Amino acid sequence: KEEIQAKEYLENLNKELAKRTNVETEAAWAYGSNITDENEKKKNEISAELAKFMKEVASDTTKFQWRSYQSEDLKRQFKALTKLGYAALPEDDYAELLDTLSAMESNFAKVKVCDYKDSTKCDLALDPEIEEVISKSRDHEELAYYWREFYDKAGTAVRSQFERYVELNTKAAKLNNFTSGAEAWLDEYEDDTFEQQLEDIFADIRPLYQQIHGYVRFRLRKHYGDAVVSETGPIPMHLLGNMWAQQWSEIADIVSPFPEKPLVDVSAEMEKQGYTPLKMFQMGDDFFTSMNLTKLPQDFWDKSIIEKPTDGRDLVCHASAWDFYLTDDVRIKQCTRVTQDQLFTVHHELGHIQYFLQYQHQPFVYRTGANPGFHEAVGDVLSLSVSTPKHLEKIGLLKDYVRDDEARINQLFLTALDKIVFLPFAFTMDKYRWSLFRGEVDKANWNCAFWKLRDEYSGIEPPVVRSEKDFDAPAKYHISADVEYLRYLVSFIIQFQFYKSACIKAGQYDPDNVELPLDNCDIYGSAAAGAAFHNMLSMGASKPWPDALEAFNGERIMSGKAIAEYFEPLRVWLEAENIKNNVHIGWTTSNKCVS
Ligand SMILES: *[C@@H]1O[C@H](CO)[C@@H](O[C@@H]2O[C@H](CO)[C@@H](O[C@@H]3O[C@H](CO[C@H]4O[C@H](CO)[C@@H](O)[C@H](O)[C@@H]4O)[C@@H](O)[C@H](O[C@H]4O[C@H](CO[C@@H]5O[C@H](CO)[C@@H](O)[C@H](O)[C@@H]5O)[C@@H](O)[C@H](O)[C@@H]4O)[C@@H]3O)[C@H](O)[C@H]2NC(C)=O)[C@H](O)[C@H]1NC(C)=O
Ligand SMILES: NCCCC[C@H](N[C@@H](CCc1ccccc1)C(=O)O)C(=O)N1CCC[C@H]1C(=O)O
Ligand SMILES: *[C@@H]1O[C@H](CO)[C@@H](O)[C@H](O)[C@H]1NC(C)=O
Ligand SMILES: *[C@@H]1O[C@H](CO)[C@@H](O)[C@H](O)[C@H]1NC(C)=O
Ligand SMILES: [Zn+2]
């Protein structure tokens, strides 16, 4: 009979937590939109106040015999409340951690480098100045300059802060009785075999990655020459069109299977048609509403930041989506540019927004993703259909396109340069941090431990020799900003499970029909695919994630079958092409990190 009282306790507590988290989120928004010493102080002081309340909440849960309850729902809510995270730390330790975290994120956001050609102009930021060069320049010495300048300033400058962060993250995890921060993060997936599952899936897809890597290296040798790219060594990462070599789509024009056949790049047509950031977001909104999903509320349009501010202010430009835990107060902060890549980013971020809107009726503790990978997958499912020649022709961004066998391979390869290449990258981000959290790497070996993983899994390496005098991991946003990365590995796998099922539901994919291939499916306008999204997303975290997956397509298991199915036509072509051209596969151990 205690359950009746507990039910009323939770109902009230959830609403209180939403209200208190609203205040924290507003402060965090203000700081991210506007980096100042005063906003930093405000963000961290509100966080400390919320942490103190959570601690009292965790303490109060012991007054309830919640493990004895009949209701799985009540038990699930109470269990969520016992998990404190960083809030478990002593008052002083939590304050220090907050200061360390803001030091790292603000350092990242304030990085400025000098122009390669003009050592007087020193106001080039990553977004958009440096990223523009990395994506567009084919001058290998220019690329190497910007790589070194950025990593030195975004990575190395923050080593001592990162070290204290690891220490306090570990202390926090242990106060929650996890072994380390690795176990704390993994707890979000509610499955004690989750690591092994991902190792198994990765092993199945790894051979395809090896083939893509080999072919790209072959093509880069033809472009840059053997003085710059070896046949048998790891690929110099500054040549891959991305600061972290996480996705290689930006160099597709020089590595495309059939260069005389069409390669989709709609950036120029977007500009020609007078596209704006506003129009891009309106188009994303249109896609969701077309599937009978929820329209963006007025607060979104009023309060979002969709262009980089033109005043002198510092801010976090790294695109993000925000839930304020009231009703319909959801926002995006994106330094939007008019490019194809940015159009996908718009859809990714709007996927988060849709999830927020779908579960906003749930009790506070359930107002989050089924697991962190689910949140990341939503927007990418739409991006997959947006990226198709089918959809791009509908919106008039792709003209005079003939979709023959060769054009199809180009498009599949372009997609793989984003989707397959990313898998080892994503895995290494957390394998690295897990190894630090678990105390498996001595402090003397922290930098080369990072590059060892990037070599082992991705077969890439720095453009210049690094050592333990450098510290390169925090040069990636999520590492400086303490954002778990496994969510993205999970997302890139399960988004294909979602995409395939949504395509089947939309009547857009049949494995026995040549006219309905998975790689040209467009789910625009499909209420049937939208219904599946509604069924899943409306659950939030009310049930363990296999139940959320089951609500979508009746499946309960994370599987690499769907991603492999999507790329199967590419795998067949590429294996044969690599044999035809005697392409070397695999790589020697890198010499670019001195121990
Ligand atoms: C992470 O793991 C930690 C363990 O490694 C864990 O820390 C333990 O939490 C326990 C609370 O659950 C706590 O147990 C209490 O111990 C008290 C005395 O211990 C002190 O002296 C010891 C010397 O012998 C030292 O070793 C300790 O460090 C302590 O200083 C007891 O006084 C206390 O008892 C009371 O509470 C129980 C409540 O239990 C329930 O009560 C209800 C009543 O409604 C029953 O129906 C139910 O069946 C159940 O019994 C009462 O039973 C009892 O009458 C007393 O009122 C209690 O046993 C322990 O001290 C603590 N540390 C260690 C080292 O064990 C953390 O909590 C974990 N953290 C998280 C977040 O989970
Ligand atoms: N040109 C970059 C746009 C970035 C878009 C996206 N941003 C992240 C931001 C995450 C975040 C967590 C906590 C606080 C603040 C922000 C996202 O998942 O939206 C992202 O990082 N993504 C999208 C998938 C891959 C991953 C990346 O790029 O590494
Ligand atoms: C940023 O914050 C400062 C104080 O920290 C405030 O005075 C200023 O108005 C803010 N800038 C913008 C553009 O909102
Ligand atoms: C739109 O969604 C509602 C429920 O949210 C559903 O009942 C209805 O069938 C959907 N519209 C169409 C045309 O399917
Ligand atoms: Zn995301």
Curated annotation (Swiss-Prot):
Substrates-to-products reaction catalysed: Release of a C-terminal dipeptide, oligopeptide-|-Xaa-Yaa, when Xaa is not Pro, and Yaa is neither Asp nor Glu. Thus, conversion of angiotensin I to angiotensin II, with increase in vasoconstrictor activity, but no action on angiotensin II
Xref: CDD domains: M2_ACE
Subcellular location, record wording: Secreted, Extracellular space
Active-site positions on this chain: E349 (proton acceptor), H478 (proton donor)
Regulation: Inhibited by captopril and, to a lesser extent, by lisinopril, trandolaprilat, fosinoprilat and enalaprilat.
Domain of life: Eukaryota
A GO biological-process term: response to symbiotic bacterium
Cofactor comment: Binds 1 zinc ion per subunit.
Name this protein carries in UniProt: Angiotensin-converting enzyme
Gene: Ance
